[PDB]
Amino acid sequence: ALNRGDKVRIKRTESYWYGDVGTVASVEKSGILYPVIVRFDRVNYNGFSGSASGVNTNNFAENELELVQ
Amino acid sequence: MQTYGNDTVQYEWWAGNARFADQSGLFIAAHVAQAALTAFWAGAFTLFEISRFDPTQAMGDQGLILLPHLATLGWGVGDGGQIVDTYPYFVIGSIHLIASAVLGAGALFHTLRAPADLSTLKGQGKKFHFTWENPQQLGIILGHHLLFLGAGALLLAGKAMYWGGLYDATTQTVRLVSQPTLDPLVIYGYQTHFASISSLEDLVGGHIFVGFLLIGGGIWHILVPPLGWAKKVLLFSGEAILSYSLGGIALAGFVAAYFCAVNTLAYPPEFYGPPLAIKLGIFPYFADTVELPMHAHTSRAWLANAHFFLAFFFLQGHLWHALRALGFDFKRVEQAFDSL
Amino acid sequence: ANLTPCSENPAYLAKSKNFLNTTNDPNSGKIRAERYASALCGPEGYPHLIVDGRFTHAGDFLIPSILFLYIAGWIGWVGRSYLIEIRESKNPEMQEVVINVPLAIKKMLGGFLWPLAAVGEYTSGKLVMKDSEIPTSPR
Amino acid sequence: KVSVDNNPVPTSFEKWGKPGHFDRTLARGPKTTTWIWNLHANAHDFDSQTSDLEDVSRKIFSAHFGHLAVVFVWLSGMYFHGAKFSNYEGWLADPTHIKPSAQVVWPIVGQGILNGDVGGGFHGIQITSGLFYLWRASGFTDSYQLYCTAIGGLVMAALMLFAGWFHYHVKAPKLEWFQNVESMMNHHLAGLLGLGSLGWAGHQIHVSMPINKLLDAGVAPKDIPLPHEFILEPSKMAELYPSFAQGLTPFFTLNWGVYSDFLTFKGGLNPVTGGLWLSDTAHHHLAIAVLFIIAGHMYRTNWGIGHSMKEILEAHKGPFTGEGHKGLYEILTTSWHAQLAINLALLGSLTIIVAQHMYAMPPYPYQAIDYATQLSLFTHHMWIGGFLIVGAGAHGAIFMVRDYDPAKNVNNLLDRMLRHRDAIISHLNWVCIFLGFHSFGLYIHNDTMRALGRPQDMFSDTAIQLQPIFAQWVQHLHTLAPGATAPNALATASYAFGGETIAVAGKVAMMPITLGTADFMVHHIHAFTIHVTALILLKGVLYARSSRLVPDKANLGFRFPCDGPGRGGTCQVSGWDHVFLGLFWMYNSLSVVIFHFSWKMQSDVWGTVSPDGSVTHVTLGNFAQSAITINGWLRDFLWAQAANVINSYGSALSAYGIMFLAGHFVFAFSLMFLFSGRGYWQELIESIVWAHNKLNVAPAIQPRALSIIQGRAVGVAHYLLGGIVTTWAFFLARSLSIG
Amino acid sequence: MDGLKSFLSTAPVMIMALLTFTAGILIEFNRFYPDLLFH
Numbered sequence A: 001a002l003n004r005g006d007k008v009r010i011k012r013t014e015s016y017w018y019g020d021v022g023t024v025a026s027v028e029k030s031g032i033l034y035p036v037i038v039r040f041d042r043v044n045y046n047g048f049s050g051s052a053s054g055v056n057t058n059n060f061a062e063n064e065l066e067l068v069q
Numbered sequence B: 001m002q003t004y005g006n007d008t009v010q011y012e013w014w015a016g017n018a019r020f021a022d023q024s025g026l027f028i029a030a031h032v033a034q035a036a037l038t039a040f041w042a043g044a045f046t047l048f049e050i051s052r053f054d055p056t057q058a059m060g061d062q063g064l065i066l067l068p069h070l071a072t073l074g075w076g077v078g079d080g081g082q083i084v085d086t087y088p089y090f091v092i093g094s095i096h097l098i099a100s101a102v103l104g105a106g107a108l109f110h111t112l113r114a115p116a117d118l119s120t121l122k123g124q125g126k127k128f129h130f131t132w133e134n135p136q137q138l139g140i141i142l143g144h145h146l147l148f149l150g151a152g153a154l155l156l157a158g159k160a161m162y163w164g165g166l167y168d169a170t171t172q173t174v175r176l177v178s179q180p181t182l183d184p185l186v187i188y189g190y191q192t193h194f195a196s197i198s199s200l201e202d203l204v205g206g207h208i209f210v211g212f213l214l215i216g217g218g219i220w221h222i223l224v225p226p227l228g229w230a231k232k233v234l235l236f237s238g239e240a241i242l243s244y245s246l247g248g249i250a251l252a253g254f255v256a257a258y259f260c261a262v263n264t265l266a267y268p269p270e271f272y273g274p275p276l277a278i279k280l281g282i283f284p285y286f287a288d289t290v291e292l293p294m295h296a297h298t299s300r301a302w303l304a305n306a307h308f309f310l311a312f313f314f315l316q317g318h319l320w321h322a323l324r325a326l327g328f329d330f331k332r333v334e335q336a337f338d339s340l
Numbered sequence C: 001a002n003l004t005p006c007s008e009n010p011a012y013l014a015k016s017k018n019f020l021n022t023t024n025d026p027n028s029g030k031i032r033a034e035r036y037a038s039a040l041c042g043p044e045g046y047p048h049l050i051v052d053g054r055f056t057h058a059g060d061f062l063i064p065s066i067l068f069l070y071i072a073g074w075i076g077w078v079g080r081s082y083l084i085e086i087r088e089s090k091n092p093e094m095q096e097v098v099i100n101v102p103l104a105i106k107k108m109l110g111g112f113l114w115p116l117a118a119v120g121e122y123t124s125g126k127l128v129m130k131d132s133e134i135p136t137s138p139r
Numbered sequence D: 001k002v003s004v005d006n007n008p009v010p011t012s013f014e015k016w017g018k019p020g021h022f023d024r025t026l027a028r029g030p031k032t033t034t035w036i037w038n039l040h041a042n043a044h045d046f047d048s049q050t051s052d053l054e055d056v057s058r059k060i061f062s063a064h065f066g067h068l069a070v071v072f073v074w075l076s077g078m079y080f081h082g083a084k085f086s087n088y089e090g091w092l093a094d095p096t097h098i099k100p101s102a103q104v105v106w107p108i109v110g111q112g113i114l115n116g117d118v119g120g121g122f123h124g125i126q127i128t129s130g131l132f133y134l135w136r137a138s139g140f141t142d143s144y145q146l147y148c149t150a151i152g153g154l155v156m157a158a159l160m161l162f163a164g165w166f167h168y169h170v171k172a173p174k175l176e177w178f179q180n181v182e183s184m185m186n187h188h189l190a191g192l193l194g195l196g197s198l199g200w201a202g203h204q205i206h207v208s209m210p211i212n213k214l215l216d217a218g219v220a221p222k223d224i225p226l227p228h229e230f231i232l233e234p235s236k237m238a239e240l241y242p243s244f245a246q247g248l249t250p251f252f253t254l255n256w257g258v259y260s261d262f263l264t265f266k267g268g269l270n271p272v273t274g275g276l277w278l279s280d281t282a283h284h285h286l287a288i289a290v291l292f293i294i295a296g297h298m299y300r301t302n303w304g305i306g307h308s309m310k311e312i313l314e315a316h317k318g319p320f321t322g323e324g325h326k327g328l329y330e331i332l333t334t335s336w337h338a339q340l341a342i343n344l345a346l347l348g349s350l351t352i353i354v355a356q357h358m359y360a361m362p363p364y365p366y367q368a369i370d371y372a373t374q375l376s377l378f379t380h381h382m383w384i385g386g387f388l389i390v391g392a393g394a395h396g397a398i399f400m401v402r403d404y405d406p407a408k409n410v411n412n413l414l415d416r417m418l419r420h421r422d423a424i425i426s427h428l429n430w431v432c433i434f435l436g437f438h439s440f441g442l443y444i445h446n447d448t449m450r451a452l453g454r455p456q457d458m459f460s461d462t463a464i465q466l467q468p469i470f471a472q473w474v475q476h477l478h479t480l481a482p483g484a485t486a487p488n489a490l491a492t493a494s495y496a497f498g499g500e501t502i503a504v505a506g507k508v509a510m511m512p513i514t515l516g517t518a519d520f521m522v523h524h525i526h527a528f529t530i531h532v533t534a535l536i537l538l539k540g541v542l543y544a545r546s547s548r549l550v551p552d553k554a555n556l557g558f559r560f561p562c563d564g565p566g567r568g569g570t571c572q573v574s575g576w577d578h579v580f581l582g583l584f585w586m587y588n589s590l591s592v593v594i595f596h597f598s599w600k601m602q603s604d605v606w607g608t609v610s611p612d613g614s615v616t617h618v619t620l621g622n623f624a625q626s627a628i629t630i631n632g633w634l635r636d637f638l639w640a641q642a643a644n645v646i647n648s649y650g651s652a653l654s655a656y657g658i659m660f661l662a663g664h665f666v667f668a669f670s671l672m673f674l675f676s677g678r679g680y681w682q683e684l685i686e687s688i689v690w691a692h693n694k695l696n697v698a699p700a701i702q703p704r705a706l707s708i709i710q711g712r713a714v715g716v717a718h719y720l721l722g723g724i725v726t727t728w729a730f731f732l733a734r735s736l737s738i739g
Numbered sequence E: 001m002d003g004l005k006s007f008l009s010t011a012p013v014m015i016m017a018l019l020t021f022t023a024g025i026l027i028e029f030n031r032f033y034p035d036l037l038f039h
Ligand code: CLA
Pocket: B011, B013, B014, B015, B016, B017, B018, B021, B242, B246, B313, B314, B315, B316, B317, B318, B320
């Protein structure tokens, strides 16, 4: 139950962004497990060694997100 | 300011003094704060020079800058160029210190209590309101400053004649100079050897002549408004009058730097050190004939070189502001390099 | 203390007659020899430093100590608040790679109010972040 | 045949404020701090930015002009420091006694003690580069000629910078101008090497010969005629040599035998000044000029005559070699990395040849007397040569990964050599292990025989002696050469093979170097380490395409850390990591080579001389029976000769002590990057990001640890820097203490 | 020169100008007042 562009804190407890805020880019349709597309500004450890950047967008669930707006 | 369009202009903090150049009260406040800073430097540094003075040595070798400026007027000078009693230097230093205190108090008064523009006043404050476009009020301010400089020249004249005695390099005593020169033809002829005059009566005669000339210019500028022949040739803005004043003070600094290094009676050789030699290396500086041990220089060298370099950079400040007053963009010179 | 002062130490008085000139001033070793006379030396002739906190030797330690504690705090505050004012302009990455040098010069000049600003930021809560909104690592 | 495009790239300063524009993944944005290291790791990778063979080639050409500006401003700094802040005219007044110094230090923090008394009242730091003897060989007299040479060098530095801007942004050449490789080869042969050798032959005839002749006669400074006065008055040149009255006319009628009084074949050394004869080197440079310009017309460009190299490579094919060199002309004119590997290999071996020739035939006046100049010039050129050979092993692998197209070269020498990579490497490491046991286990064996108190079972000369008979026979042939196999030569090629002891100013220039069994063992040590470095680099070249462990190595790139922890583990498998290992092995090889040089030359060659003919050396002949032990290499060389670095405080050689300890520091600092891996430091840096996020000071540039290749690169860089700085400080402080 | 002001304000040139200014004032303070172990 989130909009498209609201700040939300993550409570994944196993991700790189754990406690960092993110903007919900889109919420997909129901039925799937992790529909909440969340984008961040800080990239994670991703890619091969010596890569210039990583990824920021990620599919998250609903019950592990704390809305801060 | 110039304001080549964009009437509501915003300056950043590194040009932060350009923000109050249109307003009136802060324009008074910053300048009287600056005059408070000059009076503070004068009084506090002649006190600091009394604090670091040794009578067992000569004067100009130890960096004595303000005490020779007071001893040329002959306040606490004894015999043979020796200073044994320094009361009036401390007196004039305390006078300048309390004068700086009251000038800074007036500066903070005009910053805080007096408003920005003097057009919102009702009584005498509305008469002091000025704008950079009407030249009449600027002429009134111009004439009153002319009158005050003439009054200062008359006070120096009274110090030379009645209020005390000056100092000479011939007898090396005080001298109550009376009966100066009265002829203006020889003053017209003094445009060639003004550096070495070698007579104090001619000095006080030139001072009373330039003082009466200043009073004449003052009453002339108060009496008549500025005419229309100069308004077609002189620009009327803040930076224009800033440019004219900057060129004037740069020329005055060059003249004072020439006067310091070569004179002998307005700068005595026992107070400022020996007269200098104009030596051009990369830039024309002023070198001494003898060399001081601890890489040191006399007061004449410091005064002449500092006033020369400050006059040079004030000439380039006049150049910057005068090209700014003529409509030049100054990112046009960056756009000329970028088009290339 | 068991250390003799340099005003009467025999090894220091034997070693001060030939102190080497460091700078181009030819009397630099002699003025160093009379500058280090106030300090105390051991049995070798070298000036030791009492660091216990007693103020009679505070010129050995405490007087430069707080001097550095100004300048480091100055650098720290200039490095901190500048990051805050590039937390958003349009993109902080290029403003960290190339420097917004008028903003940097503004912070570099204004950094001499750093300890009062530090107590102000500590009281306003904008110095120390909360223990829950910080991106911690998983246990 | 000139093909130039006009204005390909606009000159603009706006691209300078956007770092990382040359690569596609760097110009997006610095999201992570590793982008910064990538900005320096791909700044010269011009093959990864452009992929059209025309933009990269003009980028290389302008980069050559920029580097040439760097060398010209460096050479200008050498001549300017020799002009203004040196004692070149003072050293020229008295070359034997006082010592050269071309750097004065500002006394600020007590470093005025570095300005030691080098002789004649002048203070400063004594130079060991020895370009003063270069200047006396060229013919410099006063400091004004060095000053005008520095001014002309700075003029040509700005001229090369303007040529770089002109050849990239105004008039840049096309790809066919670069691929004219036969015109490039014969122009570089004749017009660059041969024409430059003819220019220096003319300078050695007119300037270097008469000035050094009257300086060997004993003419004081401010009494030598100016170098142009010999041309302006040929009588002053004709009174020194009788053949100059004959004029140019015997040269054209092939009457060269009357030129024999000033183009001699003396050889050996000059007994007055302790260097090569200037008439010998003048005749030498003239002969090299003639042979190079003759060889500078071999390749056809426009006039039909000449060898195009394509059918040269077509014609060489044998039974073992299949199709021969069919395809290599298309390889070496379409890939810059193969040309870089060949040129770095041959420039590295050239620089090592330069070091191995500039110690037994000292070409400069008073160079062999100054031991610090001789030792520093030897070891520095040894290190530059070994570095460039490792770069050959690098760019061979880069050619294999990104510039090797297997469809064009089928059954040629490159394909056949890649087809039996196991039969090459499995014999190369066998001879590595055989040399390793038979050059190091000999050292362990007589170390143990000396430690067990039985010296009759060692490998000494009094013990079981391994006499190097082949080089001793070669020395016998070089001693017997002048008069039998070189009849117009008076002296030998050098006095290191065999002959008299050359003494100049109380010191020894060059005496014959006998080769005992210690030289046998240390030469096999040298051949062993050369074989191992030529194993790591060669198996980085051959195994860069694919393998049996990982057969997908070409698609992963040249510079990748690993394939993963699988197959037991595949870390350090790329062609880059073989260069990373070969750099340490070049360090070990050249350290032992310059150690053998320094100890043998200061135990059997150098030292003072006595008027009755007896020679006393610096270490009194330790290399005979004490260079065969590891404890002998430690006690008598690394402990005894390091005392001049240790006990030199409060003196002129005081900076070398705090460079000795500095080099030990950078070695020990390199071990942190070499031993540890990235993921520890990533797990620690993220905790420091937590401690920054607690105070809201965490940077928006994401701070994270170095890459794995970056960690190995900074480890090998600090290792080689620390070891070379330690050896530099030790060699300079020792050989400046011994004179 | 709209790009020269950005190139002179990159991180290496600004940190080199700041370290040159810091080393300059440190060397000048150590020339006019040398050998200060304490206060
Ligand atoms: C009569 C004196 C006078 C006055 C009233 C002004 C007034 C003004 N000038 Mg200015 N100027 C002057 C002299 C003067 N100038 C001289 C002599 C020069 C030549 C060096 C300049 C060069 C100059 C430039 C290049 C610019 C101005 C600008 C300006 C305007 C913005 C306010 C400002 O200066 O920024 C506030 C002042 C500061 C922040 C000070 C800067 C800090 C300096 C670098 C440190 C001081 C240097 C040094 C330590 C001084 C001590 C010397 C020695 C004892 C060691 C303002 C109207 C600016 C303008 O028109 O833009 C709107 C502008 O770009 N001026």
